Design a protein around this ligand. Sequence first.
Ligand SMILES: [K+]
Ligand SMILES: [K+]
Ligand SMILES: [K+]
Ligand SMILES: [K+]
Ligand SMILES: [Zn+2]
Length: 755
Amino acid sequence: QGKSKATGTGLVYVDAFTRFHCLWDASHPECPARVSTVMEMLETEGLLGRCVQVEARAVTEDELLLVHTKEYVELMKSTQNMTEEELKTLAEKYDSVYLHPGFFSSACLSVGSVLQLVDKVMTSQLRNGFSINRPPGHHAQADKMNGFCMFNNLAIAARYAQKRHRVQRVLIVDWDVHHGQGIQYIFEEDPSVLYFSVHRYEDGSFWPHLKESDSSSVGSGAGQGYNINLPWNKVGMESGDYITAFQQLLLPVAYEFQPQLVLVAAGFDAVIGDPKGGMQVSPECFSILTHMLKGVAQGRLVLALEGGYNLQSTAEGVCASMRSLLGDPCPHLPSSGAPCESALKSISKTISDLYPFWKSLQTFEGGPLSEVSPLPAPVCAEVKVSSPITGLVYDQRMMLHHNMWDSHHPELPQRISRIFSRHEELRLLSRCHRIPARLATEEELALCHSSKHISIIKSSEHMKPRDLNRLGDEYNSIFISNESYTCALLAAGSCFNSAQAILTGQVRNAVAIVRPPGHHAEKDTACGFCFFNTAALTARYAQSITRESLRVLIVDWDVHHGNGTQHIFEEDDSVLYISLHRYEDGAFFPNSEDANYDKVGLGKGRGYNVNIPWNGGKMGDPEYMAAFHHLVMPIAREFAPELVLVSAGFDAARGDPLGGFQVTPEGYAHLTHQLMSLAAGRVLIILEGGYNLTSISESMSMCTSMLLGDSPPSLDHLTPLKTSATVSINNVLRAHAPFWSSLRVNIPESLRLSL
Ligand SMILES: [K+]
Ligand SMILES: [K+]
Ligand SMILES: [K+]
Ligand SMILES: [K+]
Ligand SMILES: [Zn+2]
């Protein structure tokens, strides 16, 4: 691997795409200036030179006939030789169409451009690609033109992928503001292709004015379940509406479908300023939506230009998508990370209409969730996008903390040396920027810990063994050594240096290979192998070097609940703590009911503490992924953090001696990939628990691989879920829906109980 890795982004553009235009209406919205403005901006932004130039080719007859009829193809071919009057006379026969003697030539190159990128991506020459092509395609049907489309580019490309590259399952995502009814028809009774379209509808009042554009059209025959319409029934939708639809509906379904290729009908008429869409999505949104789709199909992703009729807005939308293909860090979302009621209705309605067919959607119990006014959903100041640098911090001195009386205690020094070695083997170390380690100050520790607790541990640099054994027994599950203080100082100060590097723009994200852990340590006591809460301290340090009100998200996927972390921020609305953890109705460590789902924080901090408790089974990727789709990411998005810290305990990992759970290194990669679209990519991953040296070295290397931008890995089946996990997920939905609107899926109990 390495030199042979598929990393490039393919771009197809040919001057032929400008050679045809409307002859009888010089004001027609589908015009040459569309693609040439996209190309002009791609160069102005410096994105064009970063793409691999891929040549266009003419689609062949047998390729067209994967979708179209020979009678229709030959009619379209014959247009080359028609007069303007003949062309107009033929165009009249179709809904919203014009013709031009060069239309057929460019249409053939428009289809073939997608096939070229599919070739390059499935033969693993390139990571992904984007054709800047016109005419568009998603409205075209087997035997007729429609909606400025002659041939259905992506439908042909889907079947081409299956026939020539032996792809089994293709996902087509259609975020163009119109319904791509041509694609829906073509794959109506075909479960080898899953078609998702999100589009303006308003109860059929918006073109194409079809009953079948509604969420009730789920496909038929063998294809029933594999066609999904998300119709917006009010105009003015924003990024939070699209992003919530992707979180609550599309991504669960897509991860369950396990496609091998994603084709995107990338129309940008949903963007601010488009004269036909009437929506208000900011271009930045399509950096997010693109990043999301890189999760399924191991990043095998091909975008093709569909609609988009404001020239700047379309070009800005393409640039926002291209930056994500090129692996640039996501922007801060300009709008709020919260959906509106009409979006939640359309989303819930579509979930309900598809609920029988998708076991991921069946995660929802149903019944009414809250409709109280939610917490504020703020927006973050713009951070200028730059090439992503991943920081890495590690120092061998953090091995010196140890247990003299029990050589077999799981918090082994070698945890961080094995993790670092695996980074050096997989060459991740040389790809990262090496952040220097440093000691936290007493002043910095005072940001969360009492001067008593600080002074106690400070004396341990000198306390003798038998005192260290007594002291350890004053705490729940703690051992101590004469270096434990210095190690805990580095585990904090190294995360400070990382947070400083992130927030000053020296790096964009970072990984901190540190011990001892912190997320159990309290204001005033050590606990659960932790002395100082380096996660909480780092959040405060971030607030100290930026501004006191800087929003920070702490995600804790350690199998243990970080009680100390919960408490330090239980009244705080400037820091959001989300924890996934084993609980067993209170039996599992730390044996406190603080870790239950109904502990939503206290005071101004109500809603700013999310507990996802696991009971009754081996939990793994399927449950942790569903928790992220339905809880972690919706809430995090709505909170709109400016920095993400991860209490990264790999003790939920397969083969961990303490957790008993079966999260895989591939799962951890996808959890990391999810979080990378938050906080404009400002993620810092801090090691907590996890004690199987093999599983943690593999898991954290995968996390860093994601931070560095590599394609997400393959996964086991993510359905069915354990039923206790389903129950606990819905408990968090009910607990936190009054605070967070992105959670408010309202599907009736009737559908759950009708299966
Ligand atoms: K659509
Ligand atoms: K289908
Ligand atoms: K369109
Ligand atoms: K946790
Ligand atoms: Zn742990």
